[PDB]
Amino acid sequence: TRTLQWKCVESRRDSKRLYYGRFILSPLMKGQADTIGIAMRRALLGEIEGTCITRAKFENIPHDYSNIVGIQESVHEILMNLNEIVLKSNLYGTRNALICVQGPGYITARDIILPPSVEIVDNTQHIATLTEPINLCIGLKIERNRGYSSYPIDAVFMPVQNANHSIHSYGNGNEKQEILFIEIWTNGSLTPKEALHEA
């Protein structure tokens, strides 16, 4: 119906935390595609916000460069694993979650007690493994922000992994129209279509 249309020409879920999408937008007047592409790329790479863990609190740790008996990974490895958890939320503020489990076993991202406004993207993300039945209680802090940043966690808030666009001549120079393609890679916290709309 509309003279100028957009559509998703390809959608792909390569993994649980890596989504792909390609979109088309034609026909555009000459010079419009470049403006849209550059502004959309900068918005996708810089203006889209995400949620991640920013602070984890332990109880019986001298420093983040120490070990725990019964847990294979040290405190530093646990913090690194916690930094890789992908969350999704539409709200702002410093929400807090809780990890309260007893071993032995595997501590995955589905073991986090989240507030109702926060969701887990990948349930299978690894945090730590318990070899014996030791108590483990970790208090987490979650907020929504842009860009990047009790032990502080270096949180990277950008959920768009990469972006690309291309401009192609539509055809005969009646009005020298153009075709715009946009490629978006996200971490699963939001789909490429959601990233396009949010941008």
């Binding site: 119906t1 509309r2 100028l4 249309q5 957009w6 937008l25 419009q32 403006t35 849209i36 502004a39 959309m40 396009l196 709309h197």
Partner: peptide, 17 residues
């Protein structure tokens, strides 16, 4: 400003079912 906004309105367009 108006031209930029008009350039980015169509990405929010939906179609009748």
């Amino acid at each position: 400003s108006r031209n930029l906004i008009n350039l980015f309105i169509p990405f929010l367009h939906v179609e009748e079912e």
